[PDB]
Amino acid sequence: ALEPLVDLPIGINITRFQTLLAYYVGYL
Amino acid sequence: FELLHAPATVCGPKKSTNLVKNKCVNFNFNGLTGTGVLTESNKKFLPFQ
Numbered sequence: 835a836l837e838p839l840v841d842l843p844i845g846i847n848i849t850r851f852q853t854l855l856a857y858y859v860g861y862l
Numbered sequence: 863f864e865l866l867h868a869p870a871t872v873c874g875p876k877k878s879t880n881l882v883k884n885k886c887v888n889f890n891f892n893g894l895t896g897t898g899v900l901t902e903s904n905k906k907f908l909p910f911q
């Protein structure tokens with residue numbers, strides 16, 4: 835199980851992301 | 863000043879008391895509330911719980 839590390843009050847509407855460079859990805 | 867729907871990140875001083883174990887007491891921890899006999903435990907929480 836993954837456990838909480840960081841929890842940021844910031845109020846943004848996220849819709850995209852990218853990596854700073856193997857590495858996977860799956861949507862919740 | 864502004865407040866909104868209020869996803870606040872800043873507040874003033876929060877209150878506190880001494881810890882009164884082994885008495886029936888009206889309690890608040892972190893904003894969660896009830897009434898009970900608070901007492902010491904053998905239970906082992908994880909560091910974030």
Ligand SMILES: *[C@@H]1O[C@H](CO)[C@@H](O)[C@H](O)[C@H]1NC(C)=O
Pocket residue numbers: 845846847
């Ligand atoms: C996020 O979307 C909501 C939709 O109601 C809007 O009220 C809010 O201003 C948006 N915030 C940002 C940072 O885009």
